[PDB]
Amino acid sequence: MIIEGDGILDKRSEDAGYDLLAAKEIHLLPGEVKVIPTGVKLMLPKGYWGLIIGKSSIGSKGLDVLGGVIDEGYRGEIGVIMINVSRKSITLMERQKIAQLIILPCKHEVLEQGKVV
Amino acid sequence: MIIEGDGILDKRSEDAGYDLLAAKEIHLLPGEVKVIPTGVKLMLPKGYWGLIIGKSSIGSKGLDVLGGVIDEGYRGEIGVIMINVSRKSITLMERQKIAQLIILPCKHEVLEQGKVV
Amino acid sequence: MIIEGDGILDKRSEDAGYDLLAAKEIHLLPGEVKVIPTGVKLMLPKGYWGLIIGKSSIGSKGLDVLGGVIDEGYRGEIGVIMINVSRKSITLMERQKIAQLIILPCKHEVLEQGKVV
Numbered sequence: 160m161i162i163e164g165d166g167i168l169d170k171r172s173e174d175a176g177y178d179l180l181a182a183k184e185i186h187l188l189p190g191e192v193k194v195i196p197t198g199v200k201l202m203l204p205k206g207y208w209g210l211i212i213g214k215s216s217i218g219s220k221g222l223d224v225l226g227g228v229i230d231e232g233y234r235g236e237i238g239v240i241m242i243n244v245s246r247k248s249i250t251l252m253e254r255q256k257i258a259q260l261i262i263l264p265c266k267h268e269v270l271e272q273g274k275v276v
Numbered sequence: 277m278i279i280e281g282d283g284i285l286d287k288r289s290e291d292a293g294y295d296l297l298a299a300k301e302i303h304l305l306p307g308e309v310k311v312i313p314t315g316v317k318l319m320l321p322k323g324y325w326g327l328i329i330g331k332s333s334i335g336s337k338g339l340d341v342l343g344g345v346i347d348e349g350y351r352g353e354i355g356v357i358m359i360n361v362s363r364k365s366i367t368l369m370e371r372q373k374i375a376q377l378i379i380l381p382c383k384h385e386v387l388e389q390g391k392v393v
Numbered sequence: 394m395i396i397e398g399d400g401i402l403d404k405r406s407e408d409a410g411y412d413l414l415a416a417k418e419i420h421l422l423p424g425e426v427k428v429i430p431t432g433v434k435l436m437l438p439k440g441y442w443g444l445i446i447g448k449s450s451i452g453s454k455g456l457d458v459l460g461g462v463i464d465e466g467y468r469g470e471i472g473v474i475m476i477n478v479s480r481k482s483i484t485l486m487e488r489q490k491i492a493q494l495i496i497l498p499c500k501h502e503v504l505e506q507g508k509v510v
């Protein structure tokens with residue numbers, strides 16, 4: 160797939176997702192929510208969406224990833240919504256690994272109003 | 277697929293998930309967990325499960341979605357488990373978009389006790 | 394698939410994921426993050442990764458699961474990263490259900506630097 164930017168890294172065939180980098184330094188006080196920029200854009204392949212999910216190293220620090228659904232038609236820059244849900248302050252350095260992008264399949268169904276048994 | 281209720285919206289072919297609506301007004305104080313009702317029921321297609329995941333607009337407000345696995349055999353009403361992990365109070369209006377439902381494939385394996393190399 | 398340990402349970406064909414058990418008692422104060430051990434190891438099938446996601450019963454208690462991506466090539470013991478994002482203390486008993494493991498498909502793409510339209 161075509162991407163733009165160096166905020167996303169190539170993975171091995173045995174890894175589920177691509178590491179995403181922080182485009183700039185970010186400081187987060189306990190309970191603070193910030194949308195961290197990555198500087199990358201992508202043209203997800205037709206029939207798939209992208210899931211942003213956390214990495215064990217940052218997660219074990221009390222940081223969580225909110226939202227996380229990259230739609231196939233999105234062309235904007237990818238942003239990672241992060242909250243410090245721990246009780247201590249944390250600083251993420253520029254170009255630090257903050258999350259992962261996993262490509263998964265799309266299933267489009269038509270909504271039929273009926274009565275579920 | 278067959279659904280029941282107007283708490284879930286039809287999506288475009290380029291979107292990954294269906295927007296879920298809050299069935300009633302909800303107030304959440306910092307650190308509060310509440311199971312928000314949607315009023316919708318569904319008959320997921322055989323071979324798939326449903327994943328409830330957050331929307332960027334509410335996530336950027338410090339709200340997170342817990343749990344989130346809708347099993348293929350579930351017929352009850354879908355509920356969205358939400359926590360305010362931010363430091364300020366928040367009110368979700370009736371019929372406000374609070375989450376997304378994405379349909380993904382099922383992989384059933386048999387558990388073989390052995391020794392992993 | 395081959396596993397090692399009794400910290401993971403067999404599921405029915407209509408359930409999305411396998412219940413994961415806590416290998417030991419864990420106490421978590423509000424805002425505390427701990428990596429709970431399960432004692433299980435697995436040889437995920439080629440072409441799939443594993444997703445650790447929350448269960449409604451523990452999620453409705455204000456506990457969340459961070460990280461959660463089990464790579465196909467991982468052979469270590471599976472650990473569940475848990476945070477108490479609620480305002481009250483919680484104790485998880487030994488061998489208590491704390492999460493779920495769902496097997497999903499792998500999509501490996503090659504990164505092509507270009508210009509996304």
Ligand SMILES: O=c1ccn([C@H]2C[C@H](O)[C@@H](COP(=O)(O)O)O2)c(=O)[nH]1
Pocket residue numbers: 211225226227228229230231233236237238239240330331332333
């Ligand atoms: O964590 C996230 C979630 C979403 N988006 C982007 C791509 C999505 O297609 C778009 C649309 O918004 P939501 O439907 O996800 O709120 O926002 C991000 O950059 N980061």
Ligand SMILES: O=c1ccn([C@H]2C[C@H](O)[C@@H](COP(=O)(O)O)O2)c(=O)[nH]1
Pocket residue numbers: 328342343344345346347348350353354355356357447448449450
């Ligand atoms: O966020 C959630 C998670 C679960 N369920 C429902 C459908 C599931 O099949 C059922 C079973 O419970 P758990 O195994 O997810 O705890 O609860 C919801 O409505 N909302």
Ligand SMILES: O=c1ccn([C@H]2C[C@H](O)[C@@H](COP(=O)(O)O)O2)c(=O)[nH]1
Pocket residue numbers: 213214215216445459460461462463464465467470471472473474
């Ligand atoms: O919640 C988690 C997340 C990861 N791992 C394991 C298996 C992964 O392959 C490995 C690698 O680390 P990350 O790339 O997920 O940080 O850690 C766990 O046991 N539990």
Ligand SMILES: [Mg+2]
Pocket residue numbers: 223224340341457458
């Ligand atoms: Mg979370």
Ligand SMILES: [Mg+2]
Pocket residue numbers: 224341458
């Ligand atoms: Mg999550």
